[PDB]
Design a protein around this ligand. Structure first.
Ligand SMILES: Nc1nc2c(ncn2[C@@H]2O[C@H](COP(=O)(O)OP(=O)(O)O)[C@@H](O)[C@H]2O)c(=O)[nH]1
Ligand SMILES: [Ca+2]
Length: 308
C-alpha cells in the first residue's frame, strides 16, 4: 500500500499567475496548477488547467484596484469553487505578489481553505519594490502577516533583493525568472523526494514533520561536481540572496543528498556540517540519501529549513 502525494501550485492575482505560467512553460510534470484571479483578461491568458475567476460581481471582471478587502471578499465568495479545485491535494503551494488587492486579500483566504481541505500549505510570496512606495509596502506587510497566520510555512521574497542580482541591463523578465526559481525548485525537490525510494529514505511524512505549523521556511537546492562538491552544493542550497528568511537560526532541517555510486560517507557528513554550522544552532536534522547511478560526478543537496 504505497502513497503518492498530490502536489498543487496555486497562483493568486497577477504576479502569482505569471509565476504559474512561467512554471508551466518551464515544464513541471506530476504537479497540478490552479490559476485564481479577479482579472478576467489575464485569466484568459493563463496556461493552467484549472482557472477560477473570483469576484466578477464585485469587479465586473477587472482586478481589485489595489484594494485588499475586495480580493478577500472575492475569495470568500468563491470558497466552494476553490475547495473543489483543491480537493485531493496533499500539498498546496500558494504563490502571490503582496501589495495589490487580489494577492494581498485573496491569497490568505486560499491558504486557509487549503489547510482546511487537509493540505500541507506553503506560501511563497513577494514584497513590493521600495520604488512602489510606502503605502504598497504597508499593504503588503499586512498581507504577509495574514499569510503567516493561514499557512503551515511561508517563504517571503522581497522584490528589492532582485536589485542585488541584476546589472544595469538585465531584462526585468529575466530577474522575475530568478525569483520564480525559488518556488519552482522547491516544488521540484519535493516531487523528486516523493518519486524515489532513497537508500536512506525520506518521504512525504518527513516533509510534513518539518513543515507543518512552522512559520518561516527556507527551501533550497544546490548542485556541484569535482573537488569539494558536497560542501559547494550544500552552500548553494542554503544561499539566500533573494530570501527574507536565511538559514541562520534554523532549528530543524530536512536534507537530502543525491549522488552517484561514488557518494562518500565523509562528504555527506561535510554537507550536513555546512548546514548546521550556518544555522549556528543545534539543528534537528532529517537526513536522506539517494544513489542515482546515472549521475557520474554530480552531487545534489536539497534543504528545507524551519524552526526559526
Ligand atoms: N517578482 C515578481 N513580482 C511581481 C510580479 N508581478 C507583480 N509583482 C509584484 O506583486 C505586487 C502585486 O502585483 P499583482 O499581483 O499584479 O497585484 P494583484 O493582482 O492586484 O493583486 C506588485 O506590487 C509587485 O511588487 C512578478 O511577475 N514577479
Ligand atoms: Ca522517497
Amino acid at each position: 500500500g504505497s502513497h503518492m502525494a498530490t502536489l498543487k501550485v496555486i497562483g493568486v492575482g497577477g504576479g502569482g499567475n505569471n509565476a504559474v505560467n512561467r512554471m508551466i512553460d518551464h515544464g513541471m510534470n506530476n504537479v497540478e496548477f490552479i490559476a485564481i484571479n479577479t482579472d478576467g483578461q489575464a485569466l484568459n491568458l493563463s496556461k493552467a488547467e484549472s482557472k477560477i475567476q473570483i469576484g466578477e460581481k464585485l469587479t465586473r471582471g477587472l482586478g481589485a484596484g489595489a484594494n485588499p478587502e475586495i480580493g478577500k471578499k472575492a475569495a470568500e465568495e468563491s470558497r466552494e469553487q476553490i475547495e473543489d479545485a483543491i480537493q485531493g491535494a496533499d500539498m498546496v503551494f500558494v504563490t502571490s505578489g503582496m501589495g495589490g488587492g487580489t494577492g494581498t486579500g485573496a491569497a490568505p483566504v486560499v491558504a486557509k481553505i487549503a489547510k482546511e481541505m487537509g493540505a500541507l500549505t506553503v506560501g511563497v510570496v513577494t514584497r513590493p519594490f521600495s520604488f512602489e512606495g510606502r503605502k504598497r509596502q504597508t499593504q503588503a506587510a499586512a498581507g504577509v502577516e495574514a499569510m503567516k497566520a493561514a499557512v503551515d510555512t511561508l517563504i517571503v521574497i522581497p522584490n528589492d533583493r532582485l536589485l542585488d542580482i541584476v546589472d544595469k541591463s538585465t531584462p526585468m523578465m529575466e530577474a522575475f525568472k530568478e525569483a520564480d526559481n525559488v518556488l519552482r525548485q522547491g516544488v521540484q525537490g519535493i516531487s523528486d523526494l516523493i518519486a524515489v525510494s532513497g537508500e536512506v529514505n525520506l518521504d512525504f511524512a518527513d516533509v510534513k514533520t518539518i513543515m507543518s505549523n512552522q512559520g518561516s521556511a527556507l527551501m533550497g537546492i544546490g548542485v556541484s561536481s569535482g573537488e569539494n562538491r558536497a560542501v559547494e552544493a550544500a552552500k548553494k542550497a542554503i544561499s539566500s540572496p533573494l530570501l527574507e528568511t536565511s538559514i541562520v537560526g534554523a532549528q530543524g532541517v530536512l536534507m537530502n543528498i543525491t549522488g552517484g555510486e561514488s557518494l562518500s560517507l565523509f562528504e555527506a557528513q561535510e554537507a550536513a556540517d555546512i548546514v548546521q554550522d550556518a544555522a549556528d544552532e543545534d539543528v534537528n536534522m532529517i537526513f536522506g540519501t539517494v544513489i542515482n547511478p546515472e549521475l557520474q560526478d554530480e552531487i545534489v543537496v536539497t534543504v528545507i529549513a524551519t524552526g526559526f
